[PDB]
């Protein structure tokens, strides 16, 4: 559960705070890196 | 503390506001050499890793 797969080898760092009749709309794009 | 040579550590700095002004860390350096980049122009250039 908490650990998704067996191994998880990455060194990225990007934290923020909560992104939390309850319509939660999201749009995902990937452009210009 | 620090570490040994056979097990030298490697720290990845990839997400930071770099205050390259670590010249306060014992300014009387015994060896301050630069390869591929000049000493001060270093502070105003971008890099990935």
Swiss-Prot record, chain A:
List the carbohydrate attachment sites: 9
Partners and quaternary state? Binds to host ACE2. RBD also interacts with the N-linked glycan on 'Asn-90' of ACE2. Cleavage of S generates a polybasic C-terminal sequence on S1 that binds to host Neuropilin-1 (NRP1) and Neuropilin-2 (NRP2) receptors. Interacts with host integrin alpha-5/beta-1 (ITGA5:ITGB1) and with ACE2 in complex with integrin alpha-5/beta-1 (ITGA5:ITGB1). May interact via cytoplasmic c-terminus with M protein. May interact (via N-terminus) with host bilirubin and biliverdin, thereby preventing antibody binding to the SARS-CoV-2 spike NTD via an allosteric mechanism.
Biological role:
Attaches the virion to the cell membrane by interacting with host receptor, initiating the infection. The major receptor is host ACE2. When S2/S2' has been cleaved, binding to the receptor triggers direct fusion at the cell membrane. When S2/S2' has not been cleaved, binding to the receptor results in internalization of the virus by endocytosis using host TFRC and GRM2 and leading to fusion of the virion membrane with the host endosomal membrane. Alternatively, may use NRP1/NRP2 and integrin as entry receptors.
What name goes with this protein? Spike protein S1
Originating species: Severe acute respiratory syndrome coronavirus 2
Whole sequence portion shown: 157 to 199 of 1273
Curated annotation (Swiss-Prot), chain B:
Q: What is the effect of changing residue 1 to T?
A: In strain: Omicron/BQ.1.1, Omicron/XBB.1.5, Omicron/EG.5.1
The highest taxon in the source lineage is Viruses
Swapping residue 1 to K leads to an effect described as: In strain: Mu/B.1.621
Record's function text:
Attaches the virion to the cell membrane by interacting with host receptor, initiating the infection. The major receptor is host ACE2. When S2/S2' has been cleaved, binding to the receptor triggers direct fusion at the cell membrane. When S2/S2' has not been cleaved, binding to the receptor results in internalization of the virus by endocytosis using host TFRC and GRM2 and leading to fusion of the virion membrane with the host endosomal membrane. Alternatively, may use NRP1/NRP2 and integrin as entry receptors.
Q: How does it assemble?
A: Binds to host ACE2. RBD also interacts with the N-linked glycan on 'Asn-90' of ACE2. Cleavage of S generates a polybasic C-terminal sequence on S1 that binds to host Neuropilin-1 (NRP1) and Neuropilin-2 (NRP2) receptors. Interacts with host integrin alpha-5/beta-1 (ITGA5:ITGB1) and with ACE2 in complex with integrin alpha-5/beta-1 (ITGA5:ITGB1). May interact via cytoplasmic c-terminus with M protein. May interact (via N-terminus) with host bilirubin and biliverdin, thereby preventing antibody binding to the SARS-CoV-2 spike NTD via an allosteric mechanism.
Task: Please report the name of this protein according to its UniProt entry.
Answer: Spike protein S1
User: What is the scientific name of the source organism?
Assistant: Severe acute respiratory syndrome coronavirus 2
């Amino acid at each position: 559960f908490r650990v998704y797969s067996s191994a998880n080898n990455c060194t990225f760092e990007y934290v923020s705070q909560p992104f939390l009749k309850n319509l939660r709309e999201f749009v995902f794009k990937n452009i210009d890196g | 503390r620090f570490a040994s040579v056979y097990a030298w550590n490697r720290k990845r700095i990839s997400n930071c506001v770099a205050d390259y002004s670590v010249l306060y860390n014992f300014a009387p350096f015994f060896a301050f050499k630069c390869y591929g980049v000049s000493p001060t122009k270093l502070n105003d250039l971008c890099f990935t890793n």
